[PDB]
Design an enzyme around this catalytic site. Sequence first.
Site, PDB file in Angstrom:
ATOM      1  N   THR A   1      49.103  44.840  46.322  1.00  0.00           N
ATOM      2  CA  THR A   1      50.091  45.669  46.750  1.00  0.00           C
ATOM      3  C   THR A   1      49.582  47.234  46.247  1.00  0.00           C
ATOM      4  O   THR A   1      49.760  47.458  45.170  1.00  0.00           O
ATOM      5  CB  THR A   1      51.533  45.763  46.524  1.00  0.00           C
TER       6      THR A   1
ATOM      7  N   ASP B   1      49.838  49.380  52.431  1.00  0.00           N
ATOM      8  CA  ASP B   1      49.244  48.263  53.094  1.00  0.00           C
ATOM      9  C   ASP B   1      50.413  47.385  53.768  1.00  0.00           C
ATOM     10  O   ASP B   1      51.393  47.641  53.492  1.00  0.00           O
ATOM     11  CB  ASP B   1      48.358  47.472  52.128  1.00  0.00           C
TER      12      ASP B   1
ATOM     13  N   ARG C   1      49.909  43.697  53.299  1.00  0.00           N
ATOM     14  CA  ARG C   1      49.623  42.105  52.760  1.00  0.00           C
ATOM     15  C   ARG C   1      50.529  41.810  51.648  1.00  0.00           C
ATOM     16  O   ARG C   1      50.531  42.539  50.641  1.00  0.00           O
ATOM     17  CB  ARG C   1      48.084  42.043  52.390  1.00  0.00           C
TER      18      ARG C   1
ATOM     19  N   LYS D   1      56.185  47.420  53.792  1.00  0.00           N
ATOM     20  CA  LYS D   1      56.688  47.705  52.376  1.00  0.00           C
ATOM     21  C   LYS D   1      57.312  48.967  51.891  1.00  0.00           C
ATOM     22  O   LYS D   1      57.646  49.035  51.090  1.00  0.00           O
ATOM     23  CB  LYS D   1      55.429  47.533  51.448  1.00  0.00           C
TER      24      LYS D   1
ATOM     25  N   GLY E   1      54.994  45.947  41.899  1.00  0.00           N
ATOM     26  CA  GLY E   1      55.208  45.123  41.170  1.00  0.00           C
ATOM     27  C   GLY E   1      55.768  43.837  41.828  1.00  0.00           C
ATOM     28  O   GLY E   1      55.212  43.311  42.773  1.00  0.00           O
TER      29      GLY E   1
ATOM     30  N   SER F   1      49.698  47.137  41.382  1.00  0.00           N
ATOM     31  CA  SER F   1      48.601  46.770  40.805  1.00  0.00           C
ATOM     32  C   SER F   1      47.272  46.948  41.474  1.00  0.00           C
ATOM     33  O   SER F   1      46.409  46.744  40.690  1.00  0.00           O
ATOM     34  CB  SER F   1      49.046  45.000  40.944  1.00  0.00           C
TER      35      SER F   1
ATOM     36  N   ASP G   1      40.290  45.700  46.266  1.00  0.00           N
ATOM     37  CA  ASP G   1      41.154  44.689  45.716  1.00  0.00           C
ATOM     38  C   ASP G   1      41.450  43.815  46.570  1.00  0.00           C
ATOM     39  O   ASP G   1      41.519  44.146  47.773  1.00  0.00           O
ATOM     40  CB  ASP G   1      42.395  45.442  45.206  1.00  0.00           C
TER      41      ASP G   1
ATOM     42  N   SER H   1      45.270  43.695  48.476  1.00  0.00           N
ATOM     43  CA  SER H   1      45.349  44.898  49.605  1.00  0.00           C
ATOM     44  C   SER H   1      44.319  44.906  50.687  1.00  0.00           C
ATOM     45  O   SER H   1      43.215  44.368  50.431  1.00  0.00           O
ATOM     46  CB  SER H   1      45.418  46.161  48.815  1.00  0.00           C
TER      47      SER H   1
END
EC number: 3.4.25.1
Lengths: 204, 85, 243, 243, 244, 194, 205, 222, 250
Positions: H1, H17, H19, H33, H47, H129, H166, H169
């Site tokens: 995220t 994003d 996912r 999100k 988180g 993250s 990453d 994401s």
Amino acid sequence: SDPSSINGGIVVAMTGKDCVAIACDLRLGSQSLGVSNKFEKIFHYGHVFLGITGLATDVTTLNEMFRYKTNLYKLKEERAIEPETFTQLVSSSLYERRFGPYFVGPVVAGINSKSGKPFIAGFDLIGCIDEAKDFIVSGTASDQLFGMCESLYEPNLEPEDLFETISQALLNAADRDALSGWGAVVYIIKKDEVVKRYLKMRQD
Amino acid sequence: RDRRERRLIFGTIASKMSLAPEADLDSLIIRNDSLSGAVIAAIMQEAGLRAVRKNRYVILQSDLEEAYATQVKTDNTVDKFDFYK
Amino acid sequence: GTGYDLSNSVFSPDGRNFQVEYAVKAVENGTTSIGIKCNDGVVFAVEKLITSKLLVPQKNVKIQVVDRHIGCVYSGLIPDGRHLVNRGREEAASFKKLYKTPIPIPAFADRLGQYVQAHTLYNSVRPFGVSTIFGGVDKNGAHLYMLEPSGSYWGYKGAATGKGRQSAKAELEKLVDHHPEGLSAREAVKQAAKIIYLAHEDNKEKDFELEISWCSLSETNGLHKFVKGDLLQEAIDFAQKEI
Amino acid sequence: AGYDRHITIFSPEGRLYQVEYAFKATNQTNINSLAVRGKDCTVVISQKKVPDKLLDPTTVSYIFCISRTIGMVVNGPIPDARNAALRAKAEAAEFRYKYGYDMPCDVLAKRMANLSQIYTQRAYMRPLGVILTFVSVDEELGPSIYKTDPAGYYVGYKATATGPKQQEITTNLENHFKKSKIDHINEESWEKVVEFAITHMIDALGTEFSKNDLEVGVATKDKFFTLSAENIEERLVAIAEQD
Amino acid sequence: GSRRYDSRTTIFSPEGRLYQVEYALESISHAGTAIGIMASDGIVLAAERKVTSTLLEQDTSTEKLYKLNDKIAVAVAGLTADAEILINTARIHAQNYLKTYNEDIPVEILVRRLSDIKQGYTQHGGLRPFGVSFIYAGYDDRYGYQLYTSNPSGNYTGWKAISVGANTSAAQTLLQMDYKDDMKVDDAIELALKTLSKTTDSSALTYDRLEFATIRKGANDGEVYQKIFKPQEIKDILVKTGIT
Amino acid sequence: SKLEEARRLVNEKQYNEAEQVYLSLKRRNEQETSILELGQLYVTMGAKDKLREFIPHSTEYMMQFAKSKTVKVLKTLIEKFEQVPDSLDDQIFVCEKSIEFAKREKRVFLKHSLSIKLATLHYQKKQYKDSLALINDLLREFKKLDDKPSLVDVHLLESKVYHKLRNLAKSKASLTAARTAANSIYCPTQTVAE
Amino acid sequence: LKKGEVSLGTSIMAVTFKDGVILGADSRTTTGAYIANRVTDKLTRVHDKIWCCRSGSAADTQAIADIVQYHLELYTSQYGTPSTETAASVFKELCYENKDNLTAGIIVAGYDDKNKGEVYTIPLGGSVHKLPYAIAGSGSTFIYGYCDKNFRENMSKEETVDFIKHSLSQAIKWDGSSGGVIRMVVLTAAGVERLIFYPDEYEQL
Amino acid sequence: TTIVGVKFNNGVVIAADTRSTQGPIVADKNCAKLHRISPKIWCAGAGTAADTEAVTQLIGSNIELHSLYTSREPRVVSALQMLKQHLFKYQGHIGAYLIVAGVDPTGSHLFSIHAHGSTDVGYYLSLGSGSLAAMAVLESHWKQDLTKEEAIKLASDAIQAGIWNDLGSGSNVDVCVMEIGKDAEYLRNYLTPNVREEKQKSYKFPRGTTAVLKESIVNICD
Amino acid sequence: MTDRYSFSLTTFSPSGKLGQIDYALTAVKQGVTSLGIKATNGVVIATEKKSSSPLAMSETLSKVSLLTPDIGAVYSGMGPDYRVLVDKSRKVAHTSYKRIYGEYPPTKLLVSEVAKIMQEATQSGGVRPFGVSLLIAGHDEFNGFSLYQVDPSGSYFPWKATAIGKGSVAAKTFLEKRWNDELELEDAIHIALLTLKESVEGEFNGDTIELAIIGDENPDLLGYTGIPTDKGPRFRKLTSQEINDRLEAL
């Protein structure tokens, strides 16, 4: 350490043209020992179907609590509960406690009584919302179901085809979990009626 | 309480008196009170006396406006307490 | 309807609370007690009435002390003022506990007034029947406030309650006029003794006993203590000299 | 029976008698005040009546600064005014702590009106005996004058009057406001609105003021303060020489 | 002192009955009438709403008949506001019974819970008693159909035919003659309609001010069908009864 | 700027360009006021066909920016048409289009109000038969729908039409009915004078 | 100090002199290994003439600063104008009982027209002391050699700022947890003035 | 995220994003999100994905209630303080990592709130993250006096770097931009770098491929 | 200390009627004459703002409020009581539905829930009944537009057209002929304006009339764009300029 996976359980949900396919396994096993094959993990709440996977005591407690809430809602509104309201009610209900939360993987499947478009959503142990237009599945074996469903699911399938698609997406992955088996039940939601079907599984 | 009746009687009283051309009774009768047929003549008498006090021998609008504030203030009742309505 | 004075929170048709008025009338049936706001501090004074000679002299006192710099002198229902000064002491202790600064006089006034009015809002509490002349010295200077049972307090330059309340205020005005620039504490104590003697003339039938106390920066440097030794006798015979 | 008039209960005419009698308690001090709304600031002027010479003029005042930005003028018996001031200050504290930004005048007025309504509805409580005039400048809205009442009916005012002669000052200001058709004074400087208010107040009451008869509170942009006596004397001198 | 303003709601009279419930039993008579007939095939609940006008909404409007459970329905006679809290508590109790036993709550249990709620206020707390009386109808495998009634006093008895509200005596006298032990649902319905016609204070009988609740058991066994008669079907039985 | 320029063109009687100035045309109030001024200019030149095309197309133009201010502008434009003479057919045609629009939008109040205007225009045209039929329809509508402030006017117009037809008894009956309806309301001074 | 929670650390220092007290800090907030915000502020205005800086857990310091703001505003609204010892008192009383949960070091300094400028420091335990100067934070552990020898009494504003930069340069350079810009607050009779430094100048000496 | 936010002259813009990851396995590919506290203030959580929506729902309800009570628009400052108090009263037991951006008559604002209650303010800010990759890019490219298209391009570049570098994401890009003058608009699937390709063979099965143990029909309506 | 008034202040009279309820009804029937009527495509609720003093600002006072962006409230009783009622109702509606279900409750359940507070006030000891009568208008995707009137006793009735206040009798007896099965929003607002015309006794203009409409979901006032699920709040309130345009449409 993880009481959620002690009793085991799987669940799968499909979407289609005015049709929703929801299937579950009938097996309830305790740690290394199987107990009963009569345990069903899907319950009827109006025209909205909800399945619970995880700890069996959590399953039945949540079943009763949700039945209580939707009974009150039905008596207040003098009609059933739309699944869009149902998913948010489930999400809020799990957030009552934080230190001792229920260990469940519930999924709510249903069709709106006015728009008629299929609706399906899932949650997690805490109750994080998860809404996707393709499929949401849960249970101890969710990793097995996810890849197989992605390989098998094609959008906009014929309502009779969803049954076979979900059967192939479930059975070939159900045998890959030790705590799943002892047959399965498939529910197909249609605007006129619900098709309740069983499936044959090897007993192991 | 009818606007037409108060207008008629105000005009009748004003015709005999010496209202200035730039004096409007319609501005005086904008608000609908329970004004009696007698008070709406003593008000004009008070306006005339007010004009006489300022040495003006023809009453103006500024005195008619002040006359309404001195002869008709309230009936008290409950209007002194706005929260009742 | 009748019975507008039976309860406390009830308003009279003219809008005046009635139990508070009766408490005020109960206040006046008390020993006279004056206070002088001298330039550096304050000077309290009380006229504790000597009953039958069985009472021990110079032992029963009425000038209660709060912290170090706030003094309380009360008239009327003496126990009610006892409880009021007790709550005031608790408030001062809490303030010094959680601010570590001695309570300023106006803050103590606000606390005591809020407590006093809390007892004239309900129907299940009797209003206080005590008037206080509490005052003292703080960082900003000196203050002398009289509190009334209605909960109203004022920053007086001198006040008095009791049987000789009216007589005392006239001499207070005379003293203020005689010394417009100010007054020293040393002369203030003698003037307070004289004022109490003039007020006591109404109660000449019964015997008197005078106790005086003052808080100041020039001598007591912000500490409250009574008057003992030759100073009290000097004030007494100075005030008796003009008689 | 006859216990209707004692507590806040409805009456055969549909009236709350206790709340009605509460208003008659707001005129005990017979202190007349008015507040005008300038182009960018607000000024509230109140009569400052010192009954006895023993009073200290500085401490006696019916104007309380609620916060650094919101000022308040209250008419009625002072002890209840001080209770309201304490609650208002505490609630401004709580709102500033919880929401992090200074509250506007309307929110404070609405909260105090709600508190007064809770006082009226609960039988064991008695209604507040004061009328509060909240005055402030709101960068989000503009200059604003808010006046509540013991019942809890609050509404913004172009210009507020009070006291026994509230009606007379109301008409005196209404003639000007209806002839100038403007919702506020066009004077940009807070200097001019003070003289405007003082002149109208003098013409209304028919009295001439000195340094001590009137206390003026000024609320500029993000600032509220009370002018000292010398400021009022200078303003009066300017008015006298100008007209 | 907070005494002179007290009315002493829970006080025994010199002769020995309560006085607040006494006046609640008068307040009941000033409310709209209701009728309940116990038939062999089912139970019919009907009530005449009071204060009716052309501007009263009838499309979705039920003020005298309330649903507590899929099998159990009640009729309200009295102050609707006070009846709302009792209805909510009854629904909560029924859902808690389904929580505890996972079986349909018998009518007697809910009737006791509501009677206890009323009695608790009539006993202590110094609060005015509820000025509402209920008419309970439901089904189970215990005693079949059940038809109780409630009172502000909190006492309940079983009845083969009851009518609480205005002109109770006239309705009872009218129904007792025509009541047998073998009616079907339709006979009870027409009897109730005739009783309402003969007890109403107006002249005619228009469909706007009549409400109907019926309990039927047909091909499906073990589950009755609860239908609140809507105005479109309400105006139908008027011609069948001959009132039209 | 544009409004002042149009007013100047009016002052020079060259409002023939202020026409396009308004055609090019808080801004909601500017648009409605410009429409009103353009209608006033149309009345000033009095081109009957120009106003006949102007009014309904302005009402349709109204249902794009302001929406709410349709009844006001339509009524004031129609009343402005009264100043222009020799417009009986043109005014009748405009009122017919407006009534069609009112039927389209189901604004019953406007349709009822506009119908009594068209009846008055017919009466001025001296077409007594169609005016009588329309006025009978309006009488039927206003009888059940108790609207005494309009019933007075329709009955007065009926009395006028009957007087023009020399059936004096029916005219007297209509006048008496109007008097019955008149002395129970706040009927304005114009209608009591009539 | 929990595991993973945001902490301030770095260095904070306030020096008194003739015209008042100058209090200093940096703009770096290092969360464990990483640096989250490099332009943040460690200075909290509890009152116009009373200033406080924050060290320790970020959330704990911010919460205690908010509580102190609430109490101080109550005090100035009802009782009267505040002072340095009252500001230290509310901080100590807030920190004392919850020392098991709340664990932060606070330095408060304010200027007044009677006692001039004073500096009060609250260590982790929660005691109060009055000092001409005080340091707090992990980055402050290195300048102990410099400031103590180079400190003078009744200095002037220019010398005070010179000392503050000549002391915080070592704090920034010798510890990576402290960095970013250097923020200055000046408390004098004239008023409160905000001064900010830049990394490229105090390093060049 | 990965969630980022960039403050420019006129207003502020944030991005996220689609996912949702519960660990080594991905739950859903396209999720929202971004959480709405008010029509003018937006929040995006990081988180734990299970405290974010509950906390944002609580704050949105209370903030809209407060704005209705005050009869005025909500302010980002009040929301930030309320999040601070709520997260602090639980004493660090909630791992919610949220971004807060908004505008008000006082101006525009953008803050971040940490799990245990820590707060910070900055023109650019990325939390979570996957925040590292995007925040490096925005620190590299950011400058004073940005424009709307420049700000959205910078946010797109940051989120693209985050999704490429990453695992958790990826998929679509969701962007919300706040404009002081005009209304705030919301972009759904603004960028879709990942599009699932068609399968080489169709896995459609013949009818009756799987045997049925029993046939039954369950009633639904009365 | 606490509250010593634990006894109910509403006692059944020997005549069989509640005192305080029949007293609050009298207090309601006098005061501001408000009204609201329901049309096919929307509901219009109107009230007149009696400016007590001409130096006051009727803009600051909100005679009508927003319970939810779909449901509005109009009263005809005592000001502060209505204000406290509206604040409490907003709070409990949020608690009951936004926290648990996630959206805004429909009119039918919200009205019962708010009337719960008043029917508890007439029951809980030491308090007096609210002196207000509430006109609740709202819409929902299943039951459609609906208007509800809440009496101080706590009883709520569904009404197609209503009016409460001094002119209640005249407006109620005048609305039957005005109203029919099919209606339009502009037709409804014209009906309301005509009805309120005679019931007003002061100056008539846009400032003295408080008017709100529940209609289609307007997206301009929504405050954001990008979600096709929601299209804006259905509750909008006309300003003085908005209402003084249909005022001369009479």
